Design a protein around this ligand. Sequence first.
Ligand SMILES: CCCCCCCC/C=C/CCCCCCCC(=O)OC[C@H](COP(=O)(O)OCC[N+](C)(C)C)OC(=O)CCCCCCC/C=C/CCCCCCCC
Ligand SMILES: CCCCCCCC/C=C\CCCCCCCC(=O)OC[C@H](COP(=O)(O)OCC[N+](C)(C)C)OC(=O)CCCCCCC/C=C/CCCCCCCC
Ligand SMILES: CCCCCCCC/C=C\CCCCCCCC(=O)OC[C@H](COP(=O)(O)OCC[N+](C)(C)C)OC(=O)CCCCCCC/C=C\CCCCCCCC
Ligand SMILES: CC(C)CCC[C@@H](C)[C@H]1CC[C@H]2[C@@H]3CC=C4C[C@@H](O)CC[C@]4(C)[C@H]3CC[C@]12C
Ligand SMILES: CC(C)CCC[C@@H](C)[C@H]1CC[C@H]2[C@@H]3CC=C4C[C@@H](O)CC[C@]4(C)[C@H]3CC[C@]12C
Ligand SMILES: Nc1ncnc2c1ncn2[C@@H]1O[C@H](COP(=O)(O)OP(=O)(O)O)[C@@H](O)[C@H]1O
Ligand SMILES: *[C@@H]1O[C@H](CO)[C@@H](O)[C@H](O)[C@H]1NC(C)=O
Ligand code: ALF
Ligand SMILES: [Mg+2]
Ligand code: NA
Ligand code: NA
Lengths: 266, 982
Amino acid sequence: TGGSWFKILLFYVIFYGCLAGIFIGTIQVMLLTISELKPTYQDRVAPPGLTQIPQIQKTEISFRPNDPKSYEAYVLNIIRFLEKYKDSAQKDDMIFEDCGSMPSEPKERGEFNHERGERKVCRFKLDWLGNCSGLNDESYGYKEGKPCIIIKLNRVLGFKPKPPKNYNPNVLPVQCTGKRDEDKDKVGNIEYFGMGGFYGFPLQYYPYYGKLLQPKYLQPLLAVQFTNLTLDTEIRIECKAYGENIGYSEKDRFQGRFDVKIEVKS
Amino acid sequence: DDHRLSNTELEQKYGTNIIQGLSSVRATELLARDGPNTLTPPKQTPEIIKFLKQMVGGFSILLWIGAALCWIAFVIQYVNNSASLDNVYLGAILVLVVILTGIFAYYQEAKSTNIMASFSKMIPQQALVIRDAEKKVISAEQLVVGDVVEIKGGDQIPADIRLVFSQGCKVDNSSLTGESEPQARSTEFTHENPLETKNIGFYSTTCLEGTATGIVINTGDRTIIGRIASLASGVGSEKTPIAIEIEHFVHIVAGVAVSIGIIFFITAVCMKYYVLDAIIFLISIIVANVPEGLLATVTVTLSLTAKRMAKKNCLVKNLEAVETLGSTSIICSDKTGTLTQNRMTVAHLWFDNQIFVADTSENQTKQAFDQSSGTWASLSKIITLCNRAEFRPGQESVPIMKRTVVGDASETALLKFSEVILGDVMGIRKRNHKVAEIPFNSTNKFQLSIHETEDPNNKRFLVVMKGAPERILEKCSTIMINGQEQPLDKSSADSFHTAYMELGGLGERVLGFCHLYLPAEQFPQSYIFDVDSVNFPTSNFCFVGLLSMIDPPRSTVPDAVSKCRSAGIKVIMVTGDHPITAKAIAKSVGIISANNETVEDIAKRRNIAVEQVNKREAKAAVVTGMELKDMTPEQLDELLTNYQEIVFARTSPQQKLIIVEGCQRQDAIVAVTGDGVNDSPALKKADIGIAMGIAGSDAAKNAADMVLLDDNFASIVTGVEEGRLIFDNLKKTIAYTLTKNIAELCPFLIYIVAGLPLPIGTITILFIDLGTDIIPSIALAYEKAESDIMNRKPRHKKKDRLVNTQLAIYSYLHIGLMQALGGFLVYFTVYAQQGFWPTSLINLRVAWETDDINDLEDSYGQEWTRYQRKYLEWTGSTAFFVAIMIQQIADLIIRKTRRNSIFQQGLFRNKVIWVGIASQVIVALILSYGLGSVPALSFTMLRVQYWFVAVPHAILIWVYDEMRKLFIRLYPGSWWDKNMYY
Ligand SMILES: CCCCCCCC/C=C/CCCCCCCC(=O)OC[C@H](COP(=O)(O)OCC[N+](C)(C)C)OC(=O)CCCCCCC/C=C/CCCCCCCC
Ligand SMILES: CCCCCCCC/C=C\CCCCCCCC(=O)OC[C@H](COP(=O)(O)OCC[N+](C)(C)C)OC(=O)CCCCCCC/C=C/CCCCCCCC
Ligand SMILES: CCCCCCCC/C=C\CCCCCCCC(=O)OC[C@H](COP(=O)(O)OCC[N+](C)(C)C)OC(=O)CCCCCCC/C=C\CCCCCCCC
Ligand SMILES: CC(C)CCC[C@@H](C)[C@H]1CC[C@H]2[C@@H]3CC=C4C[C@@H](O)CC[C@]4(C)[C@H]3CC[C@]12C
Ligand SMILES: CC(C)CCC[C@@H](C)[C@H]1CC[C@H]2[C@@H]3CC=C4C[C@@H](O)CC[C@]4(C)[C@H]3CC[C@]12C
Ligand SMILES: Nc1ncnc2c1ncn2[C@@H]1O[C@H](COP(=O)(O)OP(=O)(O)O)[C@@H](O)[C@H]1O
Ligand SMILES: *[C@@H]1O[C@H](CO)[C@@H](O)[C@H](O)[C@H]1NC(C)=O
Ligand code: ALF
Ligand SMILES: [Mg+2]
Ligand code: NA
Ligand code: NA
């Protein structure tokens, strides 16, 4: 229509610019109420999940010890995860602090405020992992039919685990058992290696203060070896964490527990 | 044709003998050669085919494609084990939606009828035929062309016959012309047109009196009534204007959806996506772009309007007919029975050298013309005493102008006039004993009666007579003026002349009345009279007055015609009656304005030939059927274009259909009003056909979309206004339902191109479609008019679409984008308050949906399992749904007016709007906390703030629409008004 094209295009440019500006302003107004130190709510995350290493697909661990290529992915995943727990990686004394080798009460490093600076982090020693650290056995129990898994509790800001009342009041217990009565006899003898010889998570690594107040944070680990798995069968194992603060769900199969199915072939 | 041949030439053409008739062998041979004398019923499509054709109409084809894509996605998700079971639910819901929409569409479509089933009580069952020189009563279905038949009074003519012998035969051709006046029949070629010939009897017509003999010339569907029925059944299979508008809207929406799907599939496959992600996105596009409940809502609104109008005695047989009245620009109206009362009544009186006007209302109980008591007592005595018509038994409390009468139409009019004025007619007749009576015959053209006065003071003989005005005058020698006698002269024989022509130029039949008092000396009390016109005198009477009769207009018809014309509608009279009566009735009902003149009125007022007057000075036209017969379609187009007032007179049903088609050829929506068999082809061909209830025939009522159950012409104006309101409210409903489509579609586009976790699911938006705004969509149909709706002009059928570019643009690119932004604000609020800042959500979708990742890290370093991410996704979906609901509340508020403000129109005046708002809130609450308590169908319980996050965006939508309409009102016809008004 000639000259009115400029007028209608100008109207639409102004209208869409105003719409974008109003949307951006509403987003800023909403984000002004959002803290960068602690989340507003923890409705979905507060009861932590229990997760294992290596990261696997369909929850199945299946390998043949005689073929190194069957467990290469598992070993690579374990190496990639544990590479940050090396002794050389925790040498900075201004960032890392040497908490006790025995379980203790949670360490309160202040409040969720930008003051007080970055919070120091307890060190976790790979030697505590035991037969599953890679220091001596580079295959983490694989290559021998005795696989290792590393259990971790999902990180939640300001969350302090509460071990159940009576034994150790500073360790959150974890146990791995066969899922069914068929798996309970073929699973074998479960070996646990935790810090100080206790099966669980020491409480001094809690609470977690976030990726901005506590970078380089190391969550506690608990390695589990099996060492007596029945060959050529699929054993279903259930690892569960116990605590007053720890809850479970029938819809979320990874909340406070997880399932792993391990088959070591011949 | 057969009416021009002689008896002998008819006996050679048809191989028949009038005396002997056809043989019994040739009768069967001709029954085999030509077939039975019956009307073949039309071929109707099966009901199940009609029902099944509605499963591929509207948006159903796109929904079928969506269901197919759902099945192909589920087979892929089953080959690679995925415990979803969500595409089957969506496909089943889409199929159910298709079925329900098809059911509604089937209920909306026009019902099928066989008008030939109404040509049933007119068809004779048996026929008296002459075969083998012996008369026998055979069935009329065995008649063959060339058969000699006999017809009597009160008989239906068994076929189209050429009368060879006739004796006092009169027939009723109301099935051909719409006129119930008896027609004299003879054996002589009288007029060139076969339909006006006096020597052809027509199939399925009534022989009123006399006897006749005829040869069958046409049989079965080859008859006049058979051709009328075939023409009625053939035409009238087109789509209503509202169906065309809905089809155009469906085309627009389907084209938009198809283009978007093609573009965003072609780009998605090139964005490193695989088949499942490319087809689930296509399903989402189809579901979001299609309004899944709008067509059923349209059907519901049409049903509601039809139910409302049925309470005003207006039966709507087709649902879509409630809108056609309202876009109609031309009304073609039958005269007799439709515009008039179909009852002859006394119209004018001429006595005392004065012309009086009589009341012609259907419900009248008095006459207000000047009853001077001089010459009026004599006129009333002649009217009451010189009538043979009497009321029928069982009618005493019935209104006088509604009672049934045995007798002539002219005598019935006089009897009802005398009963209205005098109250007692039978008693007065009984008091004045009738001692002689010469009945009315067409040869005499008068009726004589000798009575005895009810005056004991005098007790003389009073001989009264009525008849044709000229015969009465030439049988009269003295006149009565002001109650006193007076000799005739040129002063009173010319006043009579002028009065006779004045009354006869109004389309009225005039009757002359006179009396004579017999002397008591030469006619004593006994004096037995001889009816042989010997004993009593039959000349030198005393003229009293003239009375004229007409079939008058209905009381509510002139005002209805005036209001329809004021609404911009052209009213055309199409009648089978004679032009002189038709023109007068057109002037009476306002079809022809008082100032306007025809091409002959100017010639008479200028004393010149009709070729001297320019055809552009005349504003009215009266065209006869014979004038129309020699008219080329371009000539008819020019005649319809050049004249605003046209009267078509003496037309056949074929000519009525021709006129309707010529009116339709001018890009016009045409309404036809009729009440007879001869109107059925035009009632069928018209965009909307309206029939009369009490006065209408069954054939007319079967061919009509609408029936006026009380014969009230004012229902036409109410229907026009209702249709005009429907067309204005349907725009609001369509815009309201189209606004939410973009708000449902934008989340999927952002989900695909930006990798955000799915803002809303495909099942979730179906609840907005079919559960949340169904009642608001219905509520927008109860809106009132913003301006004077009857003061506009009819919309242009080719230029004023129901859905134009402005409506679609304002629904898609203006309010839908605002709603999408308002929903995305709540989406980001829900996600950020749990730990996922808006920047961290970009390209997070692949890792978000991985079932094997149970430690996904948020903006704070916390680790999330897959199920908690699923629950947060469902929470965001529910928040998006609630935001769409909240913004659709404001959309409902702003879509209830197109130009006016909420302050001017009123916020609480339409309570169905608040019912719809409450339904929206209640449905959202049930979904969020009923299906959220147990997480099902991607619904979770929300926090309180997520119901109010998007309120400011709704307020902004309302503010924007209010300002836009304010500046439309402030500057009419400006750049803003042209480009921003939808
Ligand atoms: C920030 C993001 C911005 C994204 C923008 C993307 C681009 C979208 C822009 C589209 C370009 C303009 C489209 C229309 C062009 C003119 C078409 C036209 O003039 O057509 C011919 C005629 C016009 O006569 P009428 O029907 O107007 O007169 C009716 C009679 N009366 C008015 C009396 C009632 O009409 C017909 O033949 C029928 C066609 C009428 C309808 C045409 C389609 C209108 C739909 C627009 C929506 C497009 C976007 C969809 C959603 C995208 C989501 C992101
Ligand atoms: C939330 C708050 C919303 C507030 C804004 C609401 C929008 C509506 C309010 C204002 C819009 C502008 C004012 C109204 C339009 C101008 C009125 C006017 O003065 O007359 C029209 C003029 C000249 O007419 P004429 O002489 O040809 O008429 C001759 C008529 N005869 C021939 C009969 C004599 O035409 C022109 O100048 C047209 C010039 C170009 C118009 C568009 C320019 C950019 C406008 C943007 C408005 C929207 C901004 C974004 C809002 C976002 C809301 C969320
Ligand atoms: C209709 C006219 C156009 C309307 C849209 C205009 C374009 C808008 C798109 C992007 C611009 C977003 C900018 C918003 C203002 C952000 C300024 C900024 O500082 O930037 C950073 C933010 C993220 O801050 P943070 O949370 O990391 O803060 C960290 C610390 N804190 C939590 C503590 C306070 O970046 C963010 O806002 C996240 C950006 C995510 C982009 C997603 C894009 C799609 C989402 C919505 C668009 C919907 C469009 C619907 C129609 C589409 C066409 C059909
Ligand atoms: C991305 C943004 C800026 C573009 C949005 C489109 C805006 C700017 C413009 C581009 C071309 C415009 C269209 C051009 C011509 C017509 C035809 C007319 O009969 C109705 C308006 C309509 C349909 C215009 C509506 C507004 C329009 C769609
Ligand atoms: C952003 C992209 C998708 C915008 C593309 C614009 C498309 C979707 C719109 C703009 C104009 C629209 C067309 C306008 C006119 C017609 C003619 C009608 O008889 C069928 C629909 C059809 C063919 C429409 C199809 C959809 C259409 C092509
Ligand atoms: N009682 C009557 N009913 C009808 N017409 C009558 C009567 N008395 C006299 N007439 C006159 O007789 C005329 C001729 O009547 P008729 O031959 O039946 O029909 P047409 O008027 O069509 O020729 C009428 O137009 C009318 O002027
Ligand atoms: C496991 O640890 C014990 C500790 O004594 C050691 O003797 C044994 O060799 C280890 N076995 C494996 C599987 O490395
Ligand atoms: F009643 Al008509 F033509 F006037 F059928
Ligand atoms: Mg009629
Ligand atoms: Na939709
Ligand atoms: Na019709």
